[PDB]
Amino acid sequence: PSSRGEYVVAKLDDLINWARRSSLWPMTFGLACCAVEMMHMAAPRYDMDRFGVVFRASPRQSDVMIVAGTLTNKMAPALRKVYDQMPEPRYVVSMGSCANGGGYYHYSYSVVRGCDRIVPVDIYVPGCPPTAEALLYGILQLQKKIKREKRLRIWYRR
């Protein structure tokens, strides 16, 4: 057969992307209420595992961090610690108003006004709390975001 380098890189990129989105093992900070809706996303009706998303993942095997609740100033150092220990590729999902931008404690002295002040965020899931279905939509949006990555294709043209 005959094939260019550009074609080979495009197909290998699709393979690794398909594997990375098909097997997303999430770490979940269950900081507050939004953790309860994260638990409903694992329960029978939605069953995130059927997408390949394991119920429980350790911090140092995790692929995505889900920040489900209010990030207080006392807790912020610990969350950045966990984020650094995560091996790459690593993605953060910000779930709910509190994590997205402080929410209903935005004007508090003890609350970080959004977790994007601490860690980079890939997807923002609105709600207080987002419904289990709304979080599931967010995770499926992360899978499509990963599908569009072009790591190998960029590397070839460097």
Binding site: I16, S22, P44, R50, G52, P89
Partner: protein
Amino acid sequence: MFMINILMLIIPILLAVAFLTLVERKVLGYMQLRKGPNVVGPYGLLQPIADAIKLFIKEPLRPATSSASMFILAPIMALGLALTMWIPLPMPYPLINMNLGVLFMLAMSSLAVYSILWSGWASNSKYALIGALRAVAQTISYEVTLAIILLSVLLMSGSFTLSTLITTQEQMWLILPAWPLAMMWFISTLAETNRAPFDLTEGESELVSGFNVEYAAGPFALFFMAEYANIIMMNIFTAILFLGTSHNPHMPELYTINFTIKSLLLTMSFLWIRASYPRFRYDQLMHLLWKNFLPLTLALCMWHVSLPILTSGIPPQT
């Protein structure tokens, strides 16, 4: 032709371990009123491939290991021993026909605690080691009753040849004459492989970090393959030991079918048990052995030495 026959044993073992992970997630799901993997490939048939490709391209963790040598030995020792345990199993013919197959398997499994011990010592974290030490004491503890129970069974078989266990059960399964021993055997294979309600390594991770905390995705994935290889092998051994299939030398493949179905059903009973009970506390799984299983295993060992003599049913030596 023998090199081929080895790769007709090694490669199929790895694939079975690959697809035991799918079967585990789906069986647990349906016992939990959910579907489990069913999106990646039809009925989740590509979930193992996605997980495998995902881990090996994952960025490695930082080894930060006290002993580099013992860091790389632990996964090699664990993976190599798990594959080696399969060479004497009669299905219906062993790859290597040993006259002391049972002692070879018993002796080899005793070396499997070095992988736990080395990785813990090479981890470089003080709580990781205390995790490894707790696990080792559990593994060697339940080896004691496995050896004595295995000794009791072999006093009705009359040999250490694994193919002689088939002949012993030609008329009837050893599950009848030895159901008190089959109960304690089956549990000890749960505790030997560190499975629920004995998976104290995973359950108490926050309290005491497990020994495999330090390895990267690729190396950690290899520790996990060796662990389900042992779980499949210990249920294949459970089937040969207590549920012996009849062998028709003209139709060996009929043995391999009936034999394989019995191996799966016990292997899926491991999943069944995981989904049904809470975990043991460490002092409780030590109480279960040293104070319940061991007294009964010794009493039944005394019984199974006396019984063949007082019924004139001593098996042949050959």
